[PDB]
Design a binder for this molecule. Structure first.
Ligand code: HEC
Lengths: 431, 55
């Protein structure tokens, strides 16, 4: 495989997979949820859903073109998938959708129907999807009074104040030339995409997205959304992780991989090679957990989210999990590092080299927006092979051993104790 | 008195009893802590404290 890249003010980056049967072509902007003030919050979600609106999707589906979109903290994307003989049709449709006009998408009826639909979706997310809203409050309290705290989904109190003028103001300030990368993944060649872009004009705008006054800074805090009428207790807990373009990126991900993920109901998940499972399976402390190493442009998060029904033994869950985290600084073995190497090679090659072209388009767009070129997977495997136990211990002493944490929880979290015992459990007192 | 006025047996038995009764006080303190622990402390407002407990 190979990733090429060229420039004319726009950036054209591709992945010619000749074995695939489709071809995704779309623009990936460099603005995201982290580029909004807290009063126009959710305008990226509303651009996602006016791009995926019914009239626009119908006009797309007349030619056999499926639309896709994604709103992250750092990057938006607007991807159009088609057969590999219709890349010109997809480019001309994306041109007509964004560049040539926006007033037909931003009519009164389409905007009011879409605002109604996104208000319904945000309310449905707020009162029914519990582990994701725990993770969103974890971001909202780890990075508070700072633009990386804003949720990608938007809030009900802000999103019902947006009108068309704010949509157009965000479009003029963020849908720009240098801010964007046009991405073609799947079964298209790079030269075909560049010659077809130069065949059209496709000039988005003059350029220069506004620069944020405040950089992201981690802030140890907690938020407790206690709802006694829920059957479980969802809780995330994280420290300041590593951002992208850091030398400790793959080390932070391998540290997340050491303790892995778990599902107490699957039989092959209870037999993993984690030493936390011997403590966690005896009295059935949780139903599931997953360790995440989230990496953003300015900062990052490293921690775990979990859910449990054993609501009287939440503190034992947090206790054994954090003592296992303290094992990284002091006495992590060689076999755990080798196992995490093999599993992280596995899940990283599943992530970057799955068969779905829209996910490849999102990942390639994000990576060539942030760091200018895509690191191919072989050099990634060499960087994973270069990690030793001393690198993990040095990273854990830098980032894990007695550092501030951020906690978010909802449900029956009365069994979760104060902030100070969870904070003081980050250092063992025995080392 | 152990006699007819405050004399040598009185002071000796007062020393023995005085050595003895603080251990009865320690046992009553343990019983006191049990009778406390079955309902928890009060609070200076006079309302319940079952809502916001800290360890
Ligand atoms: C006759 C009154 C009384 C005496 C005497 C007394 N206690 Fe208490 N004690 C209480 C009461 C009443 C409480 C419960 C406080 C409240 O109202 O919440 C209490 C509570 C306590 C507590 C829990 C902490 C606290 O402040 O409530 C301790 C410890 C305690 N007592 C120890 C002792 C000890 C030790 C002694 C003597 C050895 C003693 N008490 C003698 C009435 C008494």
């Amino acid at each position: 495989a190979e990733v090429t890249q060229l420039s004319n003010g726009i950036v054209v980056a591709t992945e010619h997979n000749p074995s695939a049967h489709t071809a995704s072509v779309g623009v990936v902007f460099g603005s995201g949820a982290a580029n909004e003030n807290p009063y126009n919050n959710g305008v990226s979600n509303l651009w996602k859903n006016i791009f995926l609106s019914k009239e626009n999707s119908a006009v797309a589906a007349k030619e056999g073109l499926a639309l896709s979109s994604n709103i992250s903290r750092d990057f938006q994307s607007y991807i159009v998938s088609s057969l590999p003989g219709s890349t010109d049709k997809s480019l001309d449709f994306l041109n007509q959708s964004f560049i040539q006009q926006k007033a037909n998408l931003l009519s009164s009826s389409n905007f009011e129907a879409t605002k109604k639909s996104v208000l319904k979706q945000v309310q449905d997310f707020e009162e029914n999807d519990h582990p994701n809203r725990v993770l969103e409050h974890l971001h909202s309290t780890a990075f508070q009074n700072t633009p990386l705290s804003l949720p990608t989904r938007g809030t009900l109190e802000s999103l019902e104040n947006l009108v068309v003028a704010d949509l157009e103001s965000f479009a003029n300030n963020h849908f720009l030339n240098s801010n964007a990368v046009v991405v073609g993944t799947g079964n298209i060649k790079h030269e075909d995409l560049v010659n077809s872009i130069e065949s059209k004009n496709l000039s988005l705008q003059t350029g220069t997205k506004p620069v944020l006054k405040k950089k992201a800074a981690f802030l140890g805090s907690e938020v407790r959304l206690r709802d006694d009428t829920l059957p479980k207790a969802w809780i995330s807990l994280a420290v300041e992780g590593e951002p992208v373009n850091s030398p400790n990126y793959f080390v932070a991900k391998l540290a997340a991989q050491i303790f892995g993920s778990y599902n107490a109901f699957e039989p092959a998940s209870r037999l993993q090679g984690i030493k936390l499972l011997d403590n966690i399976q005896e009295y059935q402390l949780c139903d599931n957990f997953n360790h995440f190493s989230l990496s953003y442009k300015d900062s990052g998060l490293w921690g775990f989210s979990t859910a449990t029904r054993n609501v009287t033994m939440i503190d034992d869950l947090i206790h054994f999990t954090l003592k296992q985290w303290n094992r990284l600084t002091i006495s992590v073995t060689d076999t755990e590092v080798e196992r995490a190497k093999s599993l992280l090679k596995l899940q990283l090659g599943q992530l970057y080299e799955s068969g779905n072209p829209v996910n490849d388009a999102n990942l390639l767009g994000a990576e060539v927006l942030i760091k200018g070129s895509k690191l191919s997977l072989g050099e990634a495997f060499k960087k994973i092979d270069a990690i030793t136990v001393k690198d993990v211990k040095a990273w854990a002493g830098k980032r894990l051993w007695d550092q501030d944490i951020a906690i978010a929880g909802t449900g029956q979290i009365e069994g979760l104790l104060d902030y100070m015992r969870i904070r003081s459990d980050m250092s063992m007192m025995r080392w | 008195w152990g006699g007819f006025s405050v004399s040598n047996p009185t002071i000796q038995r007062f020393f023995a009893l005085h050595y003895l009764v603080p251990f009865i006080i320690a046992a009553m303190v343990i019983m006191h802590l049990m009778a406390l622990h079955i309902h928890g402390s009060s609070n200076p407002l006079g309302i319940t404290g079952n809502l916001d407990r800290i360890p």
